[model samples]
Target chain A: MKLLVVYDVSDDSKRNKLANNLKKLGLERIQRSAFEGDMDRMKDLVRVVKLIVDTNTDIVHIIPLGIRDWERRIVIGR
Target chain B: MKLLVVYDVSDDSKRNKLANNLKKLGLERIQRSAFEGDMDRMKDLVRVVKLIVDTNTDIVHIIPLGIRDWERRIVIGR
Candidate 1:
């Protein structure tokens, strides 16, 4: 699953925390504020969100995550 | 494309207005607040959002909408 990760860095301390944590996830930080990854690792992914949302990350939406070979697209958010 | 439409309707007049509008789109007003639709008809879906947001709608997320295929499932959200 391809996921476009979006986030907001609230402050310096949280920024450092999220940055280091995301690094461990092997996610490429797109901007100073964004990251992209696949949902193959949703638990780890959710863990990261859980960690980030507490302080560093304010809004984290996976943007999209699913397969791409149907007559049409289908997506579910939970 | 399968899509889950989530929205918040603020009140009665707006609810009535939404019911009339959604009926045209064949969307059943679930819980008197949300409407569900297929992403294949995005224009109509967006129009519904536009109309409802004007008065009693807020924070609508399409949830997920994209194609599903082999390999890894992928989805895109706007």
Candidate 2:
């Protein structure tokens, strides 16, 4: 399944670490704080991200993207 | 149908303007740079966001989300 992961982490180090880990998981960096992948290695992604983010201030979301939804994607600016 | 909109804008004013327009379009702000909606008012969202962002430095994406995918949503932190 295709997946989208986005994050808002205040700490630079933690953010960098999370990004690096996500990349290692074979996810494509789609944006500064977002990534896209077509794999289900969710547990490691979940565990690593959960440990790297500060629960008080960070916001991390892992959303599974359906093929139909992925088909209707739009990019207005880049 | 459900949709997610995320942005990375360099200018605060333009970013704020875009956020306001997104809210007016009935999308719920899920994070500082992300919003959620269950409508297909794609044209207006596309048009307004396109005009508010500077193509040179902005990154904005509008993604249609599938119901099954949304059910797999995983949110960590605030």
Candidate 3:
């Protein structure tokens, strides 16, 4: 479940903090908001991101990321 | 240039309105918030979507989706 996404952060500090924090969580920042991790392991990265930014700055908004492809195929009974 | 996405609309009416509007714009409703379109024509799709929904659904949020392969591959031209 390799993942990539973009997001508008609260500010410079929060962005940097988010970058660092996400790194700590073992996720790499390929682009500004683009990150990749196992779908199972990268649970609720959004909630974690909110915790890093200021609780007061309400302007922060997350945009939709296009889905390229997904491999969640469960083979039926033989 | 294909696109697939998912979003949470305000409510039933708004969702229906959005689905109809998108249909008018030649977009298909594969699933809730999940749609497909040419990447070139996706400009301001979000803006139009906002207008279709009511003005008070603050919980509406987009998520980071994954990326797959690209159609155009440019080799280094000498």
Predictions' DockQ, in order: 0.06, 0.82, 0.05
> Can you tell me the CAPRI class of model 2?
high
Per-model TM-score versus the true fold: 0.39, 0.94, 0.39
Q: Rate the local accuracy (lDDT) of all candidates.
A: 0.51, 0.86, 0.46
Per-residue C-alpha lDDT of model 2 across residues A1-78, encoded as one tens digit per residue? 688899999999999999999999899887778888986567888998988999889999899886667767898666
Q: Write the per-residue lDDT of candidate 1 for residues B1-78, one digit (tens) a residue.
A: 545444444566765676677667776543233344554566766666666654322444444545342113221121
**Segments of candidate 2 deviating more than 4 angstroms:** none
Q: List the residue pairs that clash in candidate 1.
A: A66-B73, A66-B74, A67-B73, A67-B74, A68-B69, A69-B68, A69-B69, A73-B66, A73-B67, A74-B66
After the best TM-score superposition of candidate 1, give how far the Cα of residue A38 lies from its true spot, in angstroms: 2.5
Candidate number that wins on TM-score, 1 or 2? 2
Model 1 chain A worst lDDT run, 10 consecutive residues: A69-78
Model 3 stretches with alpha carbons more than 4 Å out: A1-78, B55-78
Q: For every candidate, what is the interface RMSD in angstroms?
A: 10.8, 1.1, 16.3
Ranking by DockQ: 2, 1, 3
Please give the ranking of all candidate structures by lDDT, highest first, separated by commas: 2, 1, 3
Highest lDDT: give the candidate number.
Answer: 2
